[PDB]
Symmetry: C2
Subunit: 124 residues, 2 copies
Amino acid sequence: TTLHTIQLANPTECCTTGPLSSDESEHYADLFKVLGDPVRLRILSQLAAGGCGPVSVNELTDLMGLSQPTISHHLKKMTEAGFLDRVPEGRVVLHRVRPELFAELRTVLQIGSMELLEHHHHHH
Amino acid sequence: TLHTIQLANPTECCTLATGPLSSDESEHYADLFKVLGDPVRLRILSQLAAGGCGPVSVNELTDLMGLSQPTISHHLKKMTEAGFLDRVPEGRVVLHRVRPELFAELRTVLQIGSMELLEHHHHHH
Ligand SMILES: [As]
Ligand SMILES: [As]
């Protein structure tokens, strides 16, 4: 049996490896460039507000009030970078958020003491 | 142990990112990521954090990075205007220190389907 609790952990030490290398810096820069576009971030808001369910371009055009060609231009940039997966079988193509790169970028930005939850697993 | 967990309930999945992403501050967030989409800037952030986040002078960072003082000074100015850094005096010498606030905010905007927490297992007898 396990009793689960979620509690507050004490703050971490500020910035709990060394400085990023030339290539690792070039890579994350490239990713931040992709999210550096207000349209792209707005796209992301709407994927997020739908619970990260898959969506079609016509659904995103309805959610955003921008044209299909606009939303497509930006979905390709986002898929190419790796923030979204394209599920192309069928009559209507879906796009799905991928969590992986968002987590890597969170790590890059772990500057300062963090306030985290702690999940205690009480096995008994 | 630190653990990135998947947030498989759609209501929980993006529960901390949805609001700031949806807000009229979203264009600001995107300007911040644009500021961050420069490699030299990211490395400056790296050198600062690799020093425990103490305030550092431009002279010290030009020595650490091998880049010229006009280069680093340009980057520092853009990062300070963005709010990532601010300036703190040491007598008449100007130091730069990272500000944790915006970064914590950016972490929340990027909490898309997963999050970091600490896992602790306990046994009982
Ligand atoms: As989500
Ligand atoms: As630090």
